[PDB]
Design a protein around this ligand. Sequence first.
Ligand SMILES: [Ca+2]
Ligand SMILES: [Ca+2]
Ligand SMILES: [Ca+2]
Ligand SMILES: [Ca+2]
Ligand SMILES: [Cl-]
Ligand SMILES: [Cl-]
Ligand SMILES: [Cl-]
Ligand SMILES: [Cl-]
Ligand SMILES: [Cl-]
Ligand SMILES: [Cl-]
Ligand SMILES: [Cl-]
Ligand SMILES: [Cl-]
Ligand SMILES: [Cl-]
Ligand SMILES: [Cl-]
Ligand SMILES: [Cl-]
Ligand SMILES: [Cl-]
Ligand SMILES: [Cl-]
Ligand SMILES: [Cl-]
Ligand SMILES: [Cl-]
Ligand SMILES: [Cl-]
Lengths: 479, 479, 479, 479
Amino acid sequence: DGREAYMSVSVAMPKSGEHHGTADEQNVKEVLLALFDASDVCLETKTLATTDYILNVGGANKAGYDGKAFKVPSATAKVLAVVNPSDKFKTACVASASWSAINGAVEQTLDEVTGTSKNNFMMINAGDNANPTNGALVTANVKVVDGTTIPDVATAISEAQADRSMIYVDRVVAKVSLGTNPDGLKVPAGVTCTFGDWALNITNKSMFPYSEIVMPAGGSTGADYRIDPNYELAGFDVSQFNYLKVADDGTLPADFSAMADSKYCLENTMAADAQTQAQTTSAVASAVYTPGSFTVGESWFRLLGVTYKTLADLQVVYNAAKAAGTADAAQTQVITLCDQFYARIAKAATAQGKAVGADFASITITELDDLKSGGEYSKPDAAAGETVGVEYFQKGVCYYNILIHHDDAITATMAHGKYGVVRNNWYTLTINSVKQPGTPWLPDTTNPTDPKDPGEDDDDKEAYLSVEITVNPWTTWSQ
Amino acid sequence: DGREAYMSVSVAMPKSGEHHGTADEQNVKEVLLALFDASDVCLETKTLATTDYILNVGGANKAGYDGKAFKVPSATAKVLAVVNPSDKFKTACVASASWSAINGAVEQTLDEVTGTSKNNFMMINAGDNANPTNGALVTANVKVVDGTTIPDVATAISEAQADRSMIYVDRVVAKVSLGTNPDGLKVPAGVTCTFGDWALNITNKSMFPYSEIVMPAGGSTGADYRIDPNYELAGFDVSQFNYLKVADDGTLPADFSAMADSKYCLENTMAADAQTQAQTTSAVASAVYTPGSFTVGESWFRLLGVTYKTLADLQVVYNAAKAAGTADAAQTQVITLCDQFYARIAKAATAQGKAVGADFASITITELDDLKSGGEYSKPDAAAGETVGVEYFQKGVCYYNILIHHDDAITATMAHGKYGVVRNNWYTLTINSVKQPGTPWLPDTTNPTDPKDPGEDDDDKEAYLSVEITVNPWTTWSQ
Amino acid sequence: DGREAYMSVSVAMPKSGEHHGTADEQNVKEVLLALFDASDVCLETKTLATTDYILNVGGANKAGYDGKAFKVPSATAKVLAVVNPSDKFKTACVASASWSAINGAVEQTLDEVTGTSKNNFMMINAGDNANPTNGALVTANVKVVDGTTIPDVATAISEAQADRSMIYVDRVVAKVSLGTNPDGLKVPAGVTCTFGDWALNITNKSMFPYSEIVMPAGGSTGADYRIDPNYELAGFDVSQFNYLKVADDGTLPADFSAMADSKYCLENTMAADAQTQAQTTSAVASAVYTPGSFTVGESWFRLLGVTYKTLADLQVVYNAAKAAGTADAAQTQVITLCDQFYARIAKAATAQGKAVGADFASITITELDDLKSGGEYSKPDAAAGETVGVEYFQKGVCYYNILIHHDDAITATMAHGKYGVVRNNWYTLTINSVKQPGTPWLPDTTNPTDPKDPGEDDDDKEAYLSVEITVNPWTTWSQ
Amino acid sequence: DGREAYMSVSVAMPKSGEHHGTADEQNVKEVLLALFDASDVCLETKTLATTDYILNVGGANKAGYDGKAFKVPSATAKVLAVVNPSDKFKTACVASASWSAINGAVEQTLDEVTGTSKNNFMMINAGDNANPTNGALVTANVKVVDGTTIPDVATAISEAQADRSMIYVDRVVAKVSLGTNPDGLKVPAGVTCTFGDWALNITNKSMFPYSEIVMPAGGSTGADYRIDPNYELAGFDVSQFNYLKVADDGTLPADFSAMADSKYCLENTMAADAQTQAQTTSAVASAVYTPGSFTVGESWFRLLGVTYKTLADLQVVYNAAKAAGTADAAQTQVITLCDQFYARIAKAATAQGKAVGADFASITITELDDLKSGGEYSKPDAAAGETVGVEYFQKGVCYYNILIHHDDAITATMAHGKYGVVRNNWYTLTINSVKQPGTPWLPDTTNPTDPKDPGEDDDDKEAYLSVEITVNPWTTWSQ
Ligand SMILES: [Ca+2]
Ligand SMILES: [Ca+2]
Ligand SMILES: [Ca+2]
Ligand SMILES: [Ca+2]
Ligand SMILES: [Cl-]
Ligand SMILES: [Cl-]
Ligand SMILES: [Cl-]
Ligand SMILES: [Cl-]
Ligand SMILES: [Cl-]
Ligand SMILES: [Cl-]
Ligand SMILES: [Cl-]
Ligand SMILES: [Cl-]
Ligand SMILES: [Cl-]
Ligand SMILES: [Cl-]
Ligand SMILES: [Cl-]
Ligand SMILES: [Cl-]
Ligand SMILES: [Cl-]
Ligand SMILES: [Cl-]
Ligand SMILES: [Cl-]
Ligand SMILES: [Cl-]
């Protein structure tokens, strides 16, 4: 300590052609540097000016980032660079704190690590793929003025600038894209099915600034996995993830936007047995599904394996069942399920300040179609022990749930690394075929009677679409 | 009303690789913002400065478009953005007008919505593909200073800037490209056929600022159709469209230009039974067609299924028919049709102040070839009840009519969405083969005796070329 | 005349992906505008400033080229734009001269129409492909202040700017590229053959500023041909073309450069019967050819179908022939041809101030290899009636002659448009295979005893290489 | 001498699409020009300002490089341009020195010819591929003021600028890239193998500023070879090359970095019989190799063809061998080799200040895994006559040695030009398959008992990987 010591740094962003990010995904607003002693204790933090570092983007040094040497404590052994640090990270990462303390798990909103304008992506030391035990911190090439080896500060500065500490950084979030096959979508005979707005579901609420690298068996080079804060199966709780929900007034979550938009999420990984549907990040795709002979955009129904073109056609079956002198098992089940549908529709009508008929036989399609997210209310109430009955595809709208796969070389049932979203990976989802209608309601893989129920295994999920998922490193480009 | 209220906006231009438009096709001269209350009544309009919005082009925020929050009426619920508004739109879109009134059908010239220099393309709210009933207007994220939730104007400004209203915009016109197969053109044995200048025909005179989205049966994702002001078959009138016409002096319309040029048009859609040849936007391609053994560029003729290398060869047949003691059916028909040709040629000669022989037997190729657009005058006069007779391919020039198809997944006869030109779509026409000569005259699918005759069905059109038509979204690129 | 008249212009450079030229090939140093009356008589010429025109490059208007209207004579009917005019063109193109006079054939060096730094390419009105009779001149949209239709100069200016005269321009030269197959070159068994510097041969000395378009029979769309000043067979003279020649001191022409370089030439077209080897522009490719078992780069010889590894091996055959008591036909022919070789080698030695042995039996490889372009002197002296004898492949160097083909759809023997180099076309030559050694000397298809001998027919040329020739329009790109 | 003489120059960087270098690989910090008389004696050197030359990058002249003529000695005949000259070159290349003296072989570190920031690449005259005897120097187009041909200095300046001396330059180093097959890596059944950091090995310590071009038999066009300072087999010494070595404390050389990084090296060529493993530049690839059923990242062992999951499993075999009453050949060999392993491990423990058990039976995996580069110490001590015994794959880490091939058209055993790294070539190495584990230690093809032992023939090397090596010219791009 007390000695004159200098170092220089180069911050290098991910590099490889087709998977370069946008200008906003590589925008730099702030660079924080944390200097650690040999015991991984932070000695000092520094907010870097453009003169203080080399910025290598898309494999090239950016003009205006000078890489001039700067003074550091002589005990500096290791370095951490954080591009666009969140406010929680800036508060945790201070002098006298240890790297273990600074790297504690934290809750973060997506905006806190990407910016509300999606031009402020937090990035941190990438770590070594074939050396996971090494961790995040990079060796600091400190030139200590000792009068012998390094005689003056001018020599320390020239030596530091000729021996920069190269720090590769990774964005802390994953990127996801959704699209349909450009050559056309395969659909059942006579069906029309067009896709609309989408959203990510089951996104992580929390992360480690730097998660530990784990290499799964049968894993691909560059498909490194990570240990996030909700990794083991036993610790599961719905409070750990963000779930898509329709508002009380029937308003869809603001998360839905055009398929032309890419979406981001905190990383979300799992142990092999934790690859369960209530804790796996998924893409929710909305569509308008039109069975053959039906008019596109017109509401249609399904009950007990029977499709009904109109509410009136379904009411014919209900009225016949109610007109029975002594109702049999099939007739009783029709009345039960239409009445369960009616009470949920009546509840939604009240919550939206809208009028509906007095019972299932008296409701009209005009009253139903006027309810915002009307199809959501055909979802059975699992807390009442209800199971799927009436499905109301309001204006033909339905939703699909797509589990996001991670390493495409891993195909075995519930194998480690098969599912997940890892930082700085760009997941591309291409819908190739539609096998059947989705659900009228937003997918819900959780248990309303148990917040610790992790849901069904990911490989038990019923197939509704044929989706091709590719994973690529999310790189940067030089102007 | 009267309360301090702020909002921020982001104007996003179409985005996806190969179908990016030019710099001029994304140039911004003006941005008008219309603010609506919950009843869709315009409260205020604002001409935005570069400081007042985010401009997202080719998926990235453009430098210089700051996105700073601006003051708005507290009753603001919805927003409309118009890039490069036409003068009629700027006059219609004023405070106190309703959205239904502002969105009334209007006549527009192509220059009024693209600019005379084709660098001033009008763009408006794109609307939702899987939610057509929702319309154009986007929810405004208004931050109202209420002292409670939002304490001061600085908070309203920071909250508005952290929650921008994202408005996707679409250009109001379609883009069309014409070319030949790069690997070569298939032609009949010994034929030479080279293509020259082209033009769009039957372009709409009118449009809705925002036309209603309709989703056809069997339609593709992203191939959304629209309802324009001349959609139903019964309303057809030739006064509704722009048609290519040769001037009185034989001058070709200025609309013709090199195949290297792309062309634009107002959108023009139809009901399934309105897909008729007098109301479908088409590409008119000019060519020089040379039958085998003939000299390229030399005038040639056709009459009653017989091709004649020279006018003199045709005059031999005419003179033999006139020399008959008693002319039979075939001979009489030859005289009738050559005499009908002569009178139209003599009329054109007078209109151009040019000399021709006294009758069909006395005219020469020198006199005919000196007439501007000479081939146009071999067109029969349908008002006189004339039908095709002599075809004069002046210097081998002929024209082809190409109906522009919309959704390539729709192939059934006269199926909804098979034909049309929709806003913000780039139609690429590739000529692969020539089957026979085109017409000596500009294509004319109208009835001169009836302005309400919609012409033959689009799927009844005789095939002269083999053309591949692809449709792609017309996107933008970031520098 | 005397009336206030205004016009505006747009100069558009060639446009289409892979065949975009370089920044230097589209650089603008000067723009001359010639204004013509209805009789094609030049009324005025104007050197345009950046404010006076729109410059459309790679399909987009370039920033800084304002397109502001400018005053012109009221009798202006037509317009010619010349980008980077040569000094001869600037002298010919003056007020009171007719377009026929200005467009007279002229001699031009390549530097006079491309610039000595190859950043000053002359460009002129492109003309209509399907209307060759129309010529170069484009209709001028002149807005004449008549107080009635056009009331004031401000209106004339606004109307001119809203109705610009669009002038497409073409570079007056052709571009040629030479390369080998990237996947490898097919060569005879055990042969090594590597290609080096190349040059264009038989380049035109003269041109028309605007040559007449001609459309050949069987021609492709966009493969338009032209009539240059040395088109008919009867007019041929070697004085009309530039030919590659070795200097008196053995120095190679400066025209030779690396295959990485593209080359340019004035256009050079021919009538079908004028496609002869002394008047067809060709690419001359140099190579080092090594027969199997020979050392690469070592001199080797050929005489009367026999290859000799060394001069000494050939001298063995000569000495055996001279030692014969009575020499037979074969022995006499060996002595004749080696003695003819010796006298040309001795002449070259004298011209270079170098020493050689007294006769063929006394020369050594050291003396021969010290002669600059030594292989050139194995060329027979046709003025003495000599025919091919000794071939001296000095350091294995040989040359190939590649006739440049124009329309790849034209394959018939000596068919019109099969050979030639047309303005604004980019010819790509890809060598795929080597069939045999080239010549030790620069190719020479001329007759030294007759400057009017047009040489053999192009389709009579013996095949030494397999070369793929593609022709593409040479386009421009926008930044 | 004493006369006014002027010249102008153009410095042209390598040009062709996919093999363009980065902006840093074409950055210009300094340009030295050396002017030579007809005897190849340097008359003067000049440090050029941006006004003094044309800079052609990616085939286009860069803005700001004016190419204005400059004064030179009248005896100037030839010119050498050096972009970013090393300090040794700037000291050697002075007036009065001959080109043979300046072009003497020298030792250079990679930083001295690329810059410590890898943005200062030394470049020099490229030379002629089909004329190797010609050498580096380019003819200088000197315009000497003689009052006759050249009357004044203004004429000398204009003539020099109209006749620039074009100098093509090549970077003096090679570029190397390493990656895995994007479609996936083929591995043995049940094996996991992921690649990590890599480095170049056996890089040249020395070079000629301009090495002589040699053209191998069967060589490809553009695949020119060179004669470097350690070319003949007889001259081999390990002192001539840089070799990768683990530090005394077990630290890996700093040369190792991510596969995303490209690496550079001085050129290193060989005579056909000098293509030996101790003098051929190679890529060393690190990996984590996991045999089937083993846990990824856990240490594993191999001895006498037997793989052991744990140290304890191997100690079972050792203890059984030591417990034998009379040890046989197999048992004795096990004890010998484990004891040889133990003594090297104990030596490494001492050098790192770490504790280990007293003998092979007493060591634990915890003690071994705590040693830095632990696997390095399973390398047999060849100076003690040791051969491969215990292989300790510490945390599964192993290394592969990839000999870099030069001309892919050369495949014959030990054929000239098959191996090597030549200046201004970009070598791409793609790993397609893993056949077996690499070595626990850094590859070492040298003999510790003989610094003149050139190692085994390159074509005798045992195959561990299937690697595809492509070679391309390393070009430049224009903005
Ligand atoms: Ca998790
Ligand atoms: Ca219509
Ligand atoms: Ca010619
Ligand atoms: Ca060597
Ligand atoms: Cl923690
Ligand atoms: Cl935003
Ligand atoms: Cl709510
Ligand atoms: Cl997002
Ligand atoms: Cl209306
Ligand atoms: Cl314009
Ligand atoms: Cl008219
Ligand atoms: Cl247009
Ligand atoms: Cl002339
Ligand atoms: Cl130059
Ligand atoms: Cl000479
Ligand atoms: Cl050239
Ligand atoms: Cl030396
Ligand atoms: Cl650096
Ligand atoms: Cl050491
Ligand atoms: Cl390196």
